[PDB]
Design a protein around this ligand. Structure first.
Ligand SMILES: Nc1ncnc2c1ncn2-c1cc(O)c(COP(=O)(O)Oc2cc(-n3cnc4c(N)ncnc43)oc2CO)o1
Lengths: 431, 433
């Protein structure tokens, strides 16, 4: 039962609370640029301000050796307390080595399965308590568990954004279910079953044209969606589908595309200026993929100009993604598919294209190839573990890891094919 | 026309600052003061930087000492950040040059070096360089806002207004301050309304009166006295806003207790912020900053609900405590002045509040020397009061003193208190006759 696990986690969250309250030097917050990472940053920014802590937040694309070494040089002068969100558990040995005063809030599989690592380091990792970081909690939800020690229940809305951004909303399980229920109880969220296209608050033909959940290639243009809606007697220019319009749209799509799934979703209407948590999730993703880290934090903190930028960037991103999806050249090996793509689109396209087999996208940035591998729950249940599969990057001079269902890696740009074959081989066995 | 031509000269520097920020991709260090204007400045810069996609590290310092600067310079070796100094830097510019900071100084204090462009790495935006009086016509929050408006962030004008109130430049409203307020009104971020001061607090009026220190009316400075006073004149003491009939009845009666009833009327500024009253937001930022709650104050500027809740709590504790301190003062009278011994922290705050008809001089004895804070008001100054001259006479007694006509300080040996004050009292007597 999760309530028992939560009593055990509360021992770590109470200790983190005290470590934060009793620290009076610099505080450094390190997060990732994904929806969940940016949401974590927002939760922590609010929590720290409310507890009278000034802080310096840095967003990194990946917690590499090199980044850890650069951060470590800040320990010489005046040693900050470091708070790592969505990272640090895999890199724990480098963090012990540099002797950071650190709090690690991470849902990726842990290397050292201890909560209290030395005198200097606390690790809150749900896997340590048998909670699945791929299905039952996100980094934002770990951050929220700390925040709720101060009674900051309002920050639950950012955890919900993280649950959505990390694809842990269907089914809603574990601590994620607890968080949502706590938000509902404190009236920070209302839940409402609805069609996906209603979240966008734009003309429906555009909602349809640019939707990637589900992605319907035949309808993935303004002209084709407009015509589609015209043909079944929906006004394509309206911004919300009513009961009747929904009935007609669902029956028409399911007829023509009987495999399609998830047209109806449980919308989360949150206490935030961006009221639809699904839209906020997409917004944060888009800004994060555009390198607009501080804007993403501003959106979490409900700044009007940051939200205006977020809307603008969101729609540019979604249009660019449809274009990318149309031109991507998917290649088959034995157990996987892969593709070269643009930085910022690799992971999302891989998630969109997964059907029967893992998909791995990559992009070249200098002399190195960066990979995003995606599976699904079905594949993991049959034994997929991309964390282990992508780890084989070490044999080719690089490194990789992440979750069973989603992992990354880097290798030398000229070892692409070698790596992918070695991963293809590993994944074959796993399954 | 004249104001627009002034802004054209300032735009040369604000445009360069804008380019310097946009083009910097390393760490950004923001350093500001802990008073209302410093916290409001921090808030402006925080929004401006996030919107332009810059992460930053904000620090609040009470005073930019040589020591603080040398500590900051040790961050400089590992990283080399862009430093943005608010409400400080102009006075310390030699040290900042010495250490070769990459820096932007946004400061309304009198400049040591009267140049906007210092070298290749330092920009100083200081109103005095353009002939604008930083003590009357713009605050640090205003200087930050002049940068912000180069990005079109007119909404941040509301925090500039807060800084104007906080640094006591609201009455009269002059120069760039006046321009900022008119710009905010034109873009509908502020509404202006003449009103009574008690209406800014949105609490029961008897409590607003009880804890008011602008002005302090000792005969009304408790819940019991305020409640009774309002009951007597037929005002519901529990209502939260006085209407026009209420204000006439209040002002009619209160003049017998406090004759200078013009001090009870203000132009209220209702701003586009969760804390809609700018006078209240200014008091809230003051109380949190006095309590060391600097990050909370930044949060209030960012409209965080829990920080605002903390702010309201801290405000009202601070106000109650301040009334208790005022009630404890043992005010002594000479011929032309009042004086008191108080506590190190609050002598100047208390002296300023107590001023009514005559200058008030407070002092505390630290070790062997007595440190004094002398305050007057505009009416006294109009009648010839000049406290810098009066307080300077401390040199005759082995100490030294000076400052402004309306606000000055002095130090003398703790054994020469009576002799110093007798002299001060006599000088003031002559200035006023
Ligand atoms: N050791 C590990 N390596 C990769 N990911 C890991 C990991 N441990 C945990 N995760 C992890 C968490 C998480 O949620 C996922 C799904 O992550 P991802 O799809 O975003 O993957 C990534 C990672 C990178 N990347 C960029 N710079 C890198 C560098 N310098 N070194 C190694 N990877 C680098 O690039 C991509 C695609 O551009 O992986």
């Amino acid at each position: 039962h999760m309530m028992e696990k939560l009593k055990e986690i509360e021992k770590v969250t109470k200790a983190i609370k005290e470590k934060i309250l009793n620290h009076y030097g610099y505080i450094r917050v390190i997060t990732h640029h994904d929806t969940d990472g940016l949401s974590s940053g927002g939760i922590l920014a609010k929590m720290l301000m409310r507890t009278n802590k000034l802080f310096h937040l840095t967003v990194v694309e990946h917690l590499s050796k090199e980044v850890i070494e650069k951060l470590a040089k800040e320990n010489e002068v005046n040693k900050p307390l470091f708070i790592f969100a969505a990272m640090g558990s895999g890199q724990i040995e480098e963090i012990i080595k540099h002797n950071f005063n650190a709090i690690i809030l991470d849902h990726h599989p842990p290397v050292i399965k201890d909560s209290f690592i030395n005198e200097n380091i606390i690790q809150l990792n749900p896997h340590i308590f048998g909670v699945d970081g791929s299905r039952e909690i996100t980094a934002s939800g770990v951050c929220y568990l700390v925040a709720r020690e101060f009674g900051y229940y309002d920050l639950s809305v950012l955890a919900i954004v993280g649950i959505i951004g990390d694809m842990q909303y269907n089914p809603l399980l574990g601590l994620n279910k607890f968080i949502v229920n706590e938000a509902r109880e404190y009236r920070y969220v209302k839940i409402m079953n609805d069609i996906v296209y209603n979240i966008y608050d734009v003309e429906i033909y555009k909602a349809i044209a640019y939707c990637t959940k589900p992605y319907i290639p035949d309808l993935a243009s303004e002209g084709k969606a407009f015509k589609f809606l015209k043909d079944i007697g929906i006004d394509p220019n309206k911004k919300q589908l009513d009961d009747t319009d929904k009935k007609k749209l669902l029956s028409a799509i399911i007829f023509k595309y009987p495999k399609i799934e998830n047209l109806l979703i449980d919308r989360y209407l949150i206490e935030h200026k961006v009221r639809d948590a699904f839209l906020l999730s997409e917004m944060l993703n888009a800004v994060g993929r555009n390198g607009l880290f501080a804007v993403g934090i501003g959106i979490c903190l409900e700044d009007d100009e940051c939200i205006k930028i977020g809307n603008q960037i969101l729609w540019e991103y979604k249009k660019n993604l449809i274009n990318e999806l149309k031109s991507v050249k998917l290649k088959k090996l034995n157990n996987i598919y892969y593709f070269e793509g643009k930085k910022g689109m690799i992971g999302i396209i891989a998630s969109i294209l997964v059907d029967d087999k893992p998909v791995i996208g990559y992009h070249i940035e200098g002399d190195i190839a960066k990979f995003s591998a995606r599976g699904n729950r079905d594949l993991v249940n049959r034994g997929l573990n991309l964390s282990v599969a992508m780890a084989v990057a070490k044999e080719f001079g690089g490194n990789g890891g992440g979750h069973d269902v989603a992992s990354g890696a880097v290798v030398s740009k000229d070892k692409v094919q070698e790596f992918l074959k070695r991963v293809d081989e590993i994944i074959g066995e796993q399954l």
